[PDB]
Symmetry: D2
Subunit: 277 residues, 4 copies
Amino acid sequence: DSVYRTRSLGVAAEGIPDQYADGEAARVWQLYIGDTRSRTAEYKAWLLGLLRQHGCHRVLDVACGTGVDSIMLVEEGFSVTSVDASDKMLKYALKERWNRRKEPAFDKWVIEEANWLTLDKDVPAGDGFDAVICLGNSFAHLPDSKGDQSEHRLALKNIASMVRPGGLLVIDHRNYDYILSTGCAPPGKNIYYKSKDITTSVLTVNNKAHMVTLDYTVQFSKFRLSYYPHCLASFTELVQEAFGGRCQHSVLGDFKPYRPGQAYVPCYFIHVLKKTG
Amino acid sequence: VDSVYRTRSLGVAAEGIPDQYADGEAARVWQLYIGDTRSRTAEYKAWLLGLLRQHGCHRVLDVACGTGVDSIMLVEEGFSVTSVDASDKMLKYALKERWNRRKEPAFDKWVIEEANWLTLDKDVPAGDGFDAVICLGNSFAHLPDSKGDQSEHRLALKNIASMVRPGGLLVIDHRNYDYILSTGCAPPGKNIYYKSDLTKDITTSVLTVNNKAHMVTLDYTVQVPGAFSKFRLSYYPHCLASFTELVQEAFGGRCQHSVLGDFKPYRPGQAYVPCYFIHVLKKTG
Amino acid sequence: VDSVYRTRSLGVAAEGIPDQYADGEAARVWQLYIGDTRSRTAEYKAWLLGLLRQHGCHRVLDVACGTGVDSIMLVEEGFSVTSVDASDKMLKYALKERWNRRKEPAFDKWVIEEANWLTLDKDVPAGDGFDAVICLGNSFAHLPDSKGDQSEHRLALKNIASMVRPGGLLVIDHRNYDYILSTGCAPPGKNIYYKSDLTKDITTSVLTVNNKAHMVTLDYTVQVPGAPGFSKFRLSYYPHCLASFTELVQEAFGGRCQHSVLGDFKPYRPGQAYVPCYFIHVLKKTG
Amino acid sequence: DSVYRTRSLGVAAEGIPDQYADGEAARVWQLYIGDTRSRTAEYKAWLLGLLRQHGCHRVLDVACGTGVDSIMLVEEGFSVTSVDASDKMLKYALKERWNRRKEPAFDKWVIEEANWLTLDKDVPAGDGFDAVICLGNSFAHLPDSKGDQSEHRLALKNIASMVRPGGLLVIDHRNYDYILSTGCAPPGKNIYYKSDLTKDITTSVLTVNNKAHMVTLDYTVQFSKFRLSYYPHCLASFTELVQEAFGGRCQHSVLGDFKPYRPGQAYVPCYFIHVLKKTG
Ligand SMILES: [Ca+2]
Ligand SMILES: [Ca+2]
């Protein structure tokens, strides 16, 4: 009295699209990742300068995605190594690299699949990179299965070990302290890109935030993604213990330095930590 | 009111986390499977190169590219190759291979794109036509007959045949489903397409609706290297007579048709029961 | 981290709201179906009453009670009836009927309870035994063979047979699956068990595994009364072949029985021209 | 590339258990509804007394369930008509009536299936009842599909139309204002029935755009677990919701665990029982 499937989950076959690849939600989501490849001048400006003032040439993007950020760094003469756990995501970055393969810069761009929970064996780095970047509020995608945030610790741990001694780590996340408080996603302010009907859902388990779900809509169909609502306080100690303390933490609020008490409400918090030992 | 809640929509990815069901046990054994199939027998290679040279083909379209095995061989032998597949999961391996051999001139000229038989006419720039179109590995049988009138089969064949230039060649095969349907079991492991250095056990399920064979589901039980698991795939059981009619009709009859049984010419009623039927069609013009 | 979230667990109910999938389109068509089946043909009734009287049966156990149609007939004809089924959804209609006719002395004495063939021994108080045990309407074929060795079938039949007192009777039937398996189609609408005043169109699916028939799925397309609308529901069965079943039911008695088989209420002779839609096995327990 | 099912959802077959009726969750859930069929003395005391002081004899239980509440009223001489949308729930009520069928009182007990959203056509009352009861926080089981609480309005409206002019309507709900604030629903903090089963309850609150939308409860017992969801009604909104069901022609009144509720009061009730007396 069960249900028989035509083909095992995760199995592909020549000649037919992979499972759910042509679904309604997938289509809308396609437009989303596609109509966001266009970053903001301010962001690009902040990022380029930030890495300069630290003497960084070898960059590791651990949340590669479609490689929009990584592509910029390649064009700017950086030595880029892009990684992600999502092959569906990587497909776009790899397609871009092949198209611009004639440009010596792109031919040297390294794109590989890796998972934060096994980033150590998946990516042989040895010494470390001058900078490890994880932007776009991607870390929050990693949920908490066991409920003790053990996976969060392992993820940040491995992401940190990738930063060479005296190296820089730029990891961000949305402002969930404010989302949990208002139960809504901040205004449609154009900060990270110039790209909607977003329903926000907060799930609390025993009064402790556990997950934030977003239902993106466009006109007749929609798609959703869930996030672990990291709060500035806990995240600040979370990323620091990833190093053990040997670092110089700093927090930005939409690119400008964040000042506890400050009147302005940031949309995102960018943590810049400079590894020491 | 019962209802299924989702953390993320089906088919949606997010940076930093493995896709939908990429790490399930089934998917893992299957990956070992495609890993042990990346090799062709010498007999197969010689037959395919022989057929192509025999007709003087140069521009070849591989519509069931898959991981690229056949396409790579053709690239190495100096043909002009365009490989296409509807599965991104499998195309991934072909693209990876092309990138690693990016420096070899012939590989820098290897065209690989996503395309669906059902919308081939638009997914790929045709008009010109290819000297030869190949669809091997019993790939066509992966397409189900959802509507029940085989309309999708006809639309796929038609589009595939419209990629063949006048006087061009079409090579397409399928397992011998007449034998499977009559004995209810896939023939015992032999497969002369590739050398399987990994033992297998196939459980065969045949679904017949109103007495018409509709689907054949295969449960492949692979012997995991030092550690037994399995994965499942389904096929439309195309029979010789019906397929013969189907592929000719996709040319409007404007073609020369012949069929091989495991690389050798096939004669109706012959004692030797082939595991694969290969239809070779020479388009009139 | 993909995972399905639920509002309520499967199989759980809550007052004030309809159960799981009680109002779906399939469940609604299916309900119309059982409603148009609540009637037997005169020929079926005469045959069943005739058989029971012919062996002087008084205490009857209907192990596939369903909505209770056959049971109700027996209650009315004066038999001592105990009706049992494993499906609460179907037992609901039999219980409703008994309650409405509760004033009639015979119905107040009609026993209806929940019981599973697999645990029949404990679900119902036996020991004594019943004069006749009936399992009709091709109900037995609903039990699948999950394990693949028919152990469930053997367990169910043995439990069903143990309800038959020595010298007692067991009547159990099944559709003609030999025909279905060889033609791949259920026979064209006739069904001599009941009068179907509702048009149907049956699509037949046969699943064979390693060449052994394993399941037959029937999609019933019912013509919804005014909507000339068409909807359908699906149900599966274990394709029991005559020879196999014959062996199976006798072994449920350890061979201690007299066996005969009818083809649509008439004696069946292997090789006869008439191909029956149903096979009814009638066994007289030795003791 | 989809999934073929053996049988259609909601379709039963003689000889085999209905779908999911034998699952792990269904079992644990069975114990839950069974080890609660034993109400509290304070509750009974309260209920019986309440209906007496109003001159009620014909009672309609619109959230019948396993019939525990109705059974009590039948034993007390009330003319009872029990109704519920859940056939799996009614099964227990019906089985109890049949076993006590020999007692005249139970022979007159009417148990039928009806849905709040169609209570008008499902149940022909015409005149009405002296009292309509919906306790055990059952109304909260009705979710809000369209998101505008229209179903809630229709449900309460039909339930109210069942109360005869000058009649009584006793409807309740847990204290969600407090559960939303603490994010937890005290496991065992009942008042209607003293639970004798060990339970570990995990509370999940789901907020959609900062507006409470649903509370989910994961009941665990010893290794197995099941869950149910509720629409978290707040005293304020519910209070206007039940009143607009009549239109305002009634005398609202609120209790907190049987004792009258006084806004400001220090005691935090577990349940709020709204006793409205229809006028026009
Ligand atoms: Ca056949
Ligand atoms: Ca039936």
